[PDB]
């Protein structure tokens, strides 16, 4: 059975059925395509089915470098000893590096504009082209690696390509860790959950399991609630960059041609910095650009991301809402009135009970994004617990965490504490005005913006081998 062209429910397909009076799909014989995740032990009648993580769970910038050796090799420039990552040989963004193109047999990016013939990009992770804004972040990090390798070669003439690649990869990995734990996670969890789940780092604990938990793959999809219906592009004065400053998200998915032919990554990075994220509200959960029109240009029918999330948690054998609340040491509402108190919203609790019958059966993503957001956070108690618990394990159980004794010298750590996403944008783009820290809170130009000249660059002097 072809899960993309058939609605027959047979391995490995698990198509989502269409309910009566659906607002989009009037034909109940249709379906939303769905392939079950690959099982860790195929065709077994002994093991309880589990799924596979194809990536390194560590916060090590594997989306830049790859999580398998053949790929990590192909992403590197092996023509010389400069330790660089390979760049696009066909195109540049105002003289700057673009990601190399990939060679996919059924390239979805080509389907987003037949005439342009721009394929998907090749990166450490296979989803770099999924939206131009993500592509711009992958491209930004590729550039920073090459910039660091170049500065490191100046400071250390005897370092070969491998040494340069590894030292630059090591700094980039530390940068992703610093931006994530210092700037990003506090704004996801809020202060109370940040202190509870991520107490001050002590050192590497080899008894802390660093694997990604199956539930996290669904719970961390809470970010789908932050998605705006457009891709915003702004010029050098942060004003709408014509001709199309606000492209509907259903026309940017896998649209790698937009990066190559519509102005590169600078307009996209400025739009990300100067536009508000969408707020998750209880009757404003996720936009129709992803709920009705996900991947509309690259397949037979538009998908529903929120629906896929719930079908995926079922595919993955994930326990319901109350089981996760119990896991987290949180009270488990049994009645519609108790659920109403937990959600601080009886109207939503009733919608949930009409669907599920009991809070025990609420799918984890639905239940998680339904909870009222913690103070100065963008998730509720349950998701805070699942997300905070995961990130503490990735930190404490990583032998190469940037603050672990022996990974970096005290002076290198002092130097790395000065890095920021705004500064990286300043170092690798034509953008000369960027957000004030914290970049994830700043969103209003010019109020929240400063000149790049006021932001000190990373000082690599303590990397001198001498």
């Amino acid at each position: 059975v072809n899960c993309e062209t058939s609605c027959v429910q047979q391995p490995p397909c698990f198509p989502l059925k269409i309910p009566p009076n659906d607002p989009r799909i009037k034909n109940q014989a249709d379906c939303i395509p769905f392939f079950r995740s690959c099982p860790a032990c195929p065709g077994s009648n002994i093991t309880i089915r589990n799924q596979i993580n194809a990536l390194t769970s560590f916060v090590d910038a594997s989306m830049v470098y790859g999580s398998e050796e053949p790929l990590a090799r192909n992403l590197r420039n092996m023509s010389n000893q400069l330790g660089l990552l390979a760049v696009n040989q066909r195109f540049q963004d105002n003289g700057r590096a673009l990601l190399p193109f990939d060679n996919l047999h059924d390239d979805p990016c080509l389907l987003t504009n037949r005439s342009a013939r721009i394929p998907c990009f090749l990166a450490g992770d296979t989803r770099s082209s999924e939206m131009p804004e993500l592509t711009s972040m992958h491209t930004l990090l590729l550039r920073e690696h090459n910039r660091l390798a170049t500065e490191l070669k100046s400071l250390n003439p005897r370092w070969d390509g491998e040494r340069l690649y590894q030292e630059a990869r090591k700094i980039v990995g530390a940068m992703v860790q610093i931006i994530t734990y210092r700037d990003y996670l506090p704004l996801v969890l809020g202060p109370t959950a940040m202190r509870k789940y991520l107490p001050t780092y002590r050192s590497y604990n080899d008894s802390v399991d660093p694997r990604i938990a199956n539930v996290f793959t669904n719970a961390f999809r809470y970010g789908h609630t932050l998605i705006q219906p457009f891709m915003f592009r702004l010029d050098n004065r942060y004003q709408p960059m014509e001709p199309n400053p606000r492209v509907p998200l259903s026309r940017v998915f896998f649209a790698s041609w937009r990066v190559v032919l519509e102005g590169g990554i600078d307009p996209i990075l400025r739009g990300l910095m100067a536009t508000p994220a969408k707020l998750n509200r209880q009757n404003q959960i996720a936009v129709d650009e992803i709920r009705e029109r996900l991947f509309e240009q690259v397949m037979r029918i538009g998908l529903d991301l929120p629906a896929l999330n719930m079908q995926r948690s079922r595919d993955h054998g994930l326990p319901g809402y109350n089981a996760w609340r119990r896991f987290c040491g949180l009270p488990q509402p049994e009645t519609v009135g108790q659920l109403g108190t937990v959600l601080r919203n009886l109207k939503l609790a009733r919608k949930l009970m009409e669907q599920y019958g009991t809070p025990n059966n609420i799918d984890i993503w639905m239940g998680g994004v339904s909870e009222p957001l913690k103070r100065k956070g963008r998730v509720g108690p349950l998701l805070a617990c699942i997300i905070g618990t995961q990130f503490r394990k990735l930190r404490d159980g990583d032998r190469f965490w940037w603050e672990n004794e022996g990974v970096f010298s005290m002076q290198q750590r002092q130097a790395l504490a000065q890095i920021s996403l705004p500064r990286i944008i300043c170092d690798n783009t034509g953008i000369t005005t960027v957000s004030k820290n914290n970049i994830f809170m700043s969103n209003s130009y010019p109020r929240d913006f400063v000149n790049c000249s006021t932001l000190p660059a990373l000082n690599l002097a303590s990397w001198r081998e001498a």
């Binding site: 698990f14 860790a40 993580n53 560590f58 910038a61 989306m63 790859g66 990590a72 932050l226 963008r378």
Partner: protein, 104 residues
């Protein structure tokens, strides 16, 4: 695993020396709770017509989305204290952490 090393491996192998595949690529996820499948070990809830979950009918994922997630886009509330970059770093970071393969 080498007695000593200098950098991360690309696959993540050997980060934990006592259990060298922990956090390495192409390994089963760890589970924080026992799995819950229709038949106990493999079939997803909603797979077999009429089979309930814990005493209640399984709700179509598309029906839950239609009834609880769907909202008129003109009501969208821009987050006054978060940038769209907050969303974007989340997706980028997620792609550092997990990718769950499916058959082609």
């Amino acid at each position: 695993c080498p007695e000593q090393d200098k950098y991360r491996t690309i696959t993540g192998m050997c980060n934990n020396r006592r259990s060298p595949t922990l956090g390495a690529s192409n390994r089963a996820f760890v589970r924080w709770l026992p799995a819950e499948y229709e038949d106990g070990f493999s079939l997803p809830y909603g797979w077999t017509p009429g089979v309930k979950r814990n005493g209640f009918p399984v709700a179509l994922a598309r029906a839950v989305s239609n009834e609880i997630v769907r909202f008129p886009t003109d009501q969208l509330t821009p987050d006054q204290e978060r940038s769209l970059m907050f969303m974007q770093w989340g997706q980028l970071l997620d792609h550092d952490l997990d990718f769950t393969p499916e058959p082609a």
